[model samples]
Target: LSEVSVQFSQLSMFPFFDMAHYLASVMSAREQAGALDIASHSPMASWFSAMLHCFGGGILSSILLAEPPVGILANTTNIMLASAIWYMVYYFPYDLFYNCFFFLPIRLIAAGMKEVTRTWKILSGITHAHSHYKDAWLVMITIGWARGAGGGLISNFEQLVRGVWKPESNEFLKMSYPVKVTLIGAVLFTLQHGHYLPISRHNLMFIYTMFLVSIKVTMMLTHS
Candidate 1:
């Protein structure tokens, strides 16, 4: 699942913008992921997925206190990480992609069709909706959606923290679940989403939700 299409829910907002933004983001992911590849289907795809989920997936929770600042949008956060990882790799050269595809558009279309059909089914149930705003609350579904999607990658990172980072005496394993996930999420969220931006609330919520989501995903995958 993708970050629930960040919603701008208002009569003033265009419905299509959310969809376009999502699609543009998707194209951007492919462009970044496939830029270094022979095609989307290269052997590198697996490695890319690993990096995306582990690296992209984990760190995304950071800066949840605020939406991306202009600087982070330019991706200095990831560029720095990439440079660091490259140095770690001794200049082997590469990684991005869930974004990857030789002709990923085909798969994109297939996925899109499923999504549209699902949307239609839900929308159909409304049958000319009416609103009752007295004491009612409304919210962006994207927030919850982002958390759920972010959690999707949580399972991948348990091994990462244990194997790659190598916590002493298995310290992470001994911690309470909330503490464990929060610390990890904060670290990764900062790396993935924070750049030069100040630490703040909006980012805090966004990032925290992702880690919370990750915790659930981890627990669910193992238990379910």
Candidate 2:
């Protein structure tokens, strides 16, 4: 009989990592808002669009599990912080903050941090679910999958917010790369949680982050 050995991913550097993660996600939210604005051609489309990206994980999980709708969103700090960034990106005079994000180095570093947080979310979800249901592989997998793939899962609602309601355009049908990758990673996390695999969760997260950032960085450079 092996020990539980579920130390989980050590987050000793969480403060810095979380801040970087938050910044990276905000940048992405800005991009998503810009795209929505273009599609809707609305005076303030970015207002609703960026908040969806920022709080998508909380929104999706809460609704699906029938938890308090404002449970996670009740964090006044997160609400105000996300709103501040959204404001800067869209309404800042002369688009100065928006243009700053376009610089090559800034975007690449932000992309790197985005994957780092993404991996962290997957691992933490596995850890959280494991604590609640030690042997319930399905629950662990579901939680982990949603943590990393919540944005894609809620795309239909996000589009609806922008006045687009083409339900046929779904992530499950499209099998986008992010969705596919998160599924495999979520399964791997569950396997590790169940002790069916010997790989350390820390190393797994690191490997996933490296793979993600490399591909993203390569694409950004290649296309631009």
Candidate 3:
């Protein structure tokens, strides 16, 4: 507990949200990797897909916007932490870690954190693209949507590289939950940024949270 006291003294200047974001990333990576593993039945493929799902958002957005594509590797800490989580999800002692996360309570919290990251991505992507092209509604929407669902956008290509042609897996064609939520979030954020939304930011966020939770819980219950 002495080290805890020492760390508390230094907490004032700590990167609190950054650390929280990293935690979110770790959980996101674990969830994606686990899902991929279930689908592909290959640890290697799952690991690669997990990394893509977790980190490819910014890179895909950058590439589409003709910007430098360094986002995927820009944060080495995220890379390492994601890798560690992937390992544990697949090889933890007695399969305990995987089973623990599989429990609904823990999984739900991780899902919530993933949604938090998704909102951050959508908002940041809109702002970033807006700064580059003022009043460009399409550009803002494109980047925001890309950042939120870049993995699904590029999943087909990634699968192709693995010699798995899943034509119907396209995000647009499938209208997956992530794609739908991201699209709604992108438009809402863009409208707000353009001063067209007749709602406060806090209210908008609150409404978004309610919408997301209701949909997520409904989907989970129905699908399972």
lDDT string for model 2 (6-28, tens) is 33244443445544555556566
lDDT of 3 by residue, 1-224 (tens): 34343332232212333333344444554454235444346667666656666666777898988877765677787677667766766677787877887677666666665665677678779999988999999888989989887776787876654346778667777787788888899999899999899875546655675577667667656766
What is the per-residue lDDT of model 1 for residues 32-87, given as tens digits with 9 covering 90 to 100?
A: 42333422344344334334432332233323324442433365554444433332
Off by over 4 Å in 1: 1-43, 54-73, 86-141, 144-224
| Candidate 3 TM-score to native | 0.78
Query: Model 1 — which ten-residue stretch has the worst lDDT?
Result: 128-137
* Decreasing lDDT order of the candidates: 2, 3, 1
Q: Give stretches of model 2 more than 4 Å off.
A: 1-45
Which run of 10 residues does model 2 get worst, by summed lDDT?
Answer: 1-10
Model 3 RMSD in angstroms:
7.0
Using TM-score, give the best candidate's number.
Answer: 2
